[PDB]
Structures are given as C-alpha cells and as structure tokens.
C-alpha cells in the first residue's frame, strides 16, 4: 500500500556513542588506496 502518516527515521533512536566510528571502520575495506605526498609528514 501507500502511507504518508508515519515517521520512517526511527533507527537513530538506537544509535550510541561509537555508532559513527564503527561505521567508519566498516567502510575501511571499500576505500581506494590513499594517495601519498611522498614523505611521512611536512616535518620529514
């Protein structure tokens, strides 16, 4: 059917302290290899 009377964004009521960073950890395996400036840091 079709409904327009309910809020369908209730998942975030169950988010916790580490939700955002846990997802970032999950995403790590999908990323492309980072580019490199060619040195360890601007102080090298």
């Amino acid at each position: 059917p079709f409904d327009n009377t309910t809020y369908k964004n209730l998942q975030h009521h169950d988010y916790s302290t580490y939700t955002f960073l846990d997802l970032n950890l999950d995403l790590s395996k999908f990323r492309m290899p980072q580019p490199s400036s060619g040195r360890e840091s601007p102080r090298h």
Binding site: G38, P42, R43
Partner: protein, 87 residues
C-alpha cells in the same frame, strides 16, 4: 620594521673616553667630536667632505636587503616542507 632611517649616509668619529664625574656620577668627556654626526646624500659626497677636512676614514658599503620570494600559497604545500602547521 621601518626603513626610513636607512636612506642617507652618515659620518661619525671614533668613540673616546667617557668617565664618571666625581661629584654627581655624570658621564664626562674631553672629546669635542663625541656628538658630531654628519649627513650626506651619497658616499662620494661624504668621502669628498672627509678628504678636504684631512680626516682619515673608513667606508662601509651600503647593505640593502635582497629581494625575497614570497608566496602565501606555499603555506599549504601538498608535498613540501613549507607547509605550516598553524596559522
């Protein structure tokens, strides 16, 4: 940072004895040229003045700050040490 006091040539004389006045401790001198400082447009004018007055002199070439290469963008270099850690 002002540079307006570096435009002209100066002539000063060798520093001589200053001693403590026994009464007050003020700085006494027997050098009549202790305060004499002359101003010239060019070192050639200064040398000419010194020569005709019989003074032996030393000439120090003018030091001019060399042109620097400045780039605000270098503060954020992608792979150079010029990148700044703070602003």
């Amino acid at each position: 940072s002002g540079v307006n006091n570096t435009k002209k040539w100066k002539m000063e004389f060798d520093t001589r004895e200053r001693w403590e006045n026994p009464l007050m401790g003020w700085a006494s001198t027997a050098d009549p040229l202790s305060n004499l400082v002359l101003t010239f447009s060019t070192k050639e004018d200064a040398v000419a003045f010194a020569e005709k007055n019989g003074w032996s002199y030393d000439v120090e070439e003018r030091k001019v700050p060399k042109p620097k290469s400045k780039s605000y963008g270098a503060n954020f270099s992608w792979n150079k040490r010029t990148r700044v850690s703070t602003k």
